[PDB]
């Protein structure tokens, strides 16, 4: 429940008015995959 | 640091034919400061 408040924050940055930006989506995917703990413990494997 | 930035700015525009008014704005901005540090470096070494 704590980390869900940070994930619904980041939908607002990568998706604006129904069209996805390319610069912010490129830098948030590049940042999330270096840290496996930002995903759930199942996908990090069940 | 300024050499590798204008050189990579050239490699980004190496495939395009013409440059718009946005690119020649930023290139003359970078070349004018590059001349100032060129003038800053020569007066350091113009004295004997």
């Amino acid at each position: 429940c704590g980390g869900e408040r940070y994930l619904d924050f980041l939908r607002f940055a990568v998706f604006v008015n129904g069209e996805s930006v390319e610069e912010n989506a490129n830098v948030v995917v590049r940042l999330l995959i270096r840290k496996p703990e930002c995903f759930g413990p199942a996908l990090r494997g069940s | 640091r300024l050499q590798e930035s204008i050189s990579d700015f050239y490699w980004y525009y190496s495939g395009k034919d013409v440059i718009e008014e946005q690119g020649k704005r930023n290139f003359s901005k970078a070349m004018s400061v590059a001349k100032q540090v060129f003038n800053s470096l020569t007066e350091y070494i113009q004295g004997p």
Binding site: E4, V14, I33 | -
Partner: protein, 49 residues
């Protein structure tokens, strides 16, 4: 599941559109190759079912 659905749709809204895949951009098919290989398909076919 509220964390996972916030995790999944975040991975959906950061995906490139169809006109970037239609071009010769090597960046857009790279991101789509990471997210398709990050989360499998048949796991989502079971969850939607």
């Amino acid at each position: 599941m509220s964390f996972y659905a916030a995790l999944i749709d975040l991975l959906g809204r950061c995906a490139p559109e169809m006109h970037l895949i239609q071009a010769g951009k090597g960046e857009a098919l790279r991101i789509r190759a990471i997210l398709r290989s990050l989360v499998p398909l048949d796991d989502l076919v079971g969850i939607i079912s």
